[PDB]
Design a protein around this ligand. Structure first.
Ligand SMILES: [Cl-]
Length: 331
């Protein structure tokens, strides 16, 4: 089919990207140009810039998932994920609120649940937790010290995460990162790793054997964070999209936005890299374009999605795909 995915060609390591700038919070560029930028600013290994490999271009060509895939070295598991949900707002709205004109019960419940998430607070929580984890490895040369350090700070902050099982997504995140266990990567040395964040936007009602109503309008009970830790159980995420209502509407299953480990104190100024869709240059769907959005442009989302997870994982310190400072556009 002419809409078949294409792997973009190799870009010479010295090829400079074309200029582009954000418009109302979002910069974008065709994937070929993004590869050029990536090579210049994110490719470094031990401070040495590198060409994006044929394999990485293949990954990248899958779309927004591909940005995160390349940057972390791994197809996203989303196993360790946070969100902020206002349980009080939700239950009150259900009890005392009145459905908007025409809304059925299921529509209303779906909406009130979508609206009771706060993506800024969800990101803030992931970021805070990531920094604890980063402090915990800073001078830990074995996992054992890392877990000690981590527990100390969580106990000192009287954090709900302090109570997670030893086998939980949270405590097992580090040792379950492939690159932690490479001699080239972390070499079982926590201090040679870095916590990194990305976000997934996705649909709550993915279960084939619940109501049509949930598939269409959202499942208010699905992907609610644990109120204490803020952890989201992503185990029931099956990459299934919202089912349509309106005649010509279609929905995609997800969006993925890469944050990395930017130091910027203002969450709103953080840059999130995602994209439109997989690379389809031979068809009217068109080439993949990469988007670099300020947080609020990211967090705004789309009708396709009523859920957002802020995921933590790890990469080797020696990489440079999560630098302290990320710029939208070029130069
Ligand atoms: Cl191409």
């Amino acid at each position: 089919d002419s809409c078949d995915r294409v792997t973009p060609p190799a870009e010479p390591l010295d090829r400079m990207p074309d200029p582009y700038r954000p418009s109302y919070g979002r910069a974008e560029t065709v994937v070929n140009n993004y590869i050029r930028k990536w090579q210049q600013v994110y490719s470094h290994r031990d401070g040495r810039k590198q060409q994006m490999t044929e394999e990485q271009r293949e990954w990248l060509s899958y779309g927004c998932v591909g940005v995160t895939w390349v940057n972390s070295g791994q197809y996203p598991t989303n196993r360790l994920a946070f969100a902020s949900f206002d349980e009080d707002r939700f239950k009150n709205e259900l009890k005392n609120g009145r459905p908007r004109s025409g809304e059925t019960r299921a529509e209303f419940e779906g909406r009130v649940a979508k609206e009771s998430f706060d993506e800024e607070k969800g990101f803030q929580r992931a970021r805070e937790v990531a920094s604890v984890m980063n402090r915990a490895l800073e001078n830990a040369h074995d996992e054992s010290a890392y877990l000690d350090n981590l527990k100390k700070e969580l106990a000192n902050g009287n954090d709900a995460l302090r109570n997670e099982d030893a086998r939980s997504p949270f405590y097992s995140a580090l040792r379950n990162t492939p690159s932690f266990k490479e001699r080239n990567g972390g070499n079982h040395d926590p201090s040679r790793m870095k916590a990194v964040i990305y976000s997934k936007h996705f649909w709550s009602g993915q279960d084939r054997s619940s109501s049509a109503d949930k598939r269409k309008y959202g499942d208010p009970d699905a992907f609610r964070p644990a109120p204490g830790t803020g952890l989201v159980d992503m185990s029931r995420d099956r990459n299934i999209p919202r089912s349509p209502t309106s005649p010509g509407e279609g929905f995609v299953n997800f969006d993925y936005g890469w944050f990395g480990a930017q130091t910027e104190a203002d969450a709103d100024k953080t840059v999130w890299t995602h994209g439109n869709h997989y690379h389809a240059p031979n068809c009217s769907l068109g080439a993949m374009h990469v988007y670099e959005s300020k947080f609020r442009n990211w967090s705004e989302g789309y009708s396709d999605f009523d859920r957002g997870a802020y995921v933590i994982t790890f990469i080797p310190k020696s990489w440079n795909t999560a630098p302290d400072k990320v710029k939208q556009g070029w130069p």
